[PDB]
Structure 1
């Protein structure tokens, strides 16, 4: 199913699990990556991937983008490189599909998506000055898998 079907925020918030059953599990494997035993403050460089447009990102997209980003960090810094990446959003919004025609149209439950407002941090990675260009590359690959245009922003980091 194309994202065109779910990317917009044209529907009421639909997250109350006490009134919604049969919700598919999330495909997102992890939210905390790298060295989760270490603190973010232990790093000189902090780069975030910022969403430029308000949208809904299906859990399948979060996984694909997160995967393609962390997979790169692993390939360039090693399975235990000195870095830590975070996917701060969780797919709370439940999605439907009307899969009879328009009669009794209320859709059956098909998935979940995360609502992200423009200007927000979807991903935030923490690394050393050396690995700064590696995290910028992970993010480049990550924004190619989500609907909106993004900004790769260096927050804590002035070895520039």
Structure 2
């Protein structure tokens, strides 16, 4: 199904699992990447900031995450970097798949609501920003236009 069907916050928050059942698992493999054994004690901290409020399905969350991290293997399988996708897909989404009769939909997926300006991804690295390219690929697979933002780096 197209992102067109769910990218907008056009429905009330539907996340209570005590009342919703049969929610598909998440396609997002991990939320912590890189040397997650270590702390965010790095020199440079870049982040991908979404420019529009939107709902991002776990479908796109996993494609963007892979697209970025997989590429961040320009540093090495066990390289010296950190990477965190900080949002979780809490919104349960449905699809009415009798025409418009009794059309409440059936759970078909989950998405993460992200407001304009929130950062969806954050990386921590040493002056080794192959990450800015990692996000160019990441922002390439999520609905909104985004802006890559270096948070702590005067090391031009």
Q: Runs of 5+ in structure 2 lacking a partner?
A: none
Aligned residue for 1:144? 140
CA distance in 2 between counterparts of 1:32 and 1:88 reads 9
Number of matched pairs:
156
Aligned residue for 1:37? 37
Aligned residue for 1:118? 116
Task: After the TM superposition, list the runs of 4 or more consecutive aligned residues in structure 1 that deviate by more than 6 angstroms.
Answer: none
Aligned residue for 2:90? 92
SS in 2 for 1:77: coil
SS in 2 for 1:105: coil
Aligned residue for 1:27? 27
Q: Runs of 5+ in structure 1 lacking a partner?
A: none
Aligned residue for 1:103? 101
- Compute the displacement of 1:86 (Å): 0.2
Deviations 1:96-143 (A, max 9, x none): 0000100001001100000000000000000001x11x0000000000
| Larger helix share, 1 or 2 | 1
CA distance in 1 between counterparts of 2:94 and 2:131 reads 35
CA distance in 2 between counterparts of 1:127 and 1:57 reads 26
- Compute the displacement of 1:51 (Å): 0.2
- Compute the displacement of 1:78 (Å): 0.5
- Compute the displacement of 1:23 (Å): 0.1
| RMSD of aligned alpha carbons | 0.4
TM-score computed with the length of structure 2 as normaliser: 0.99
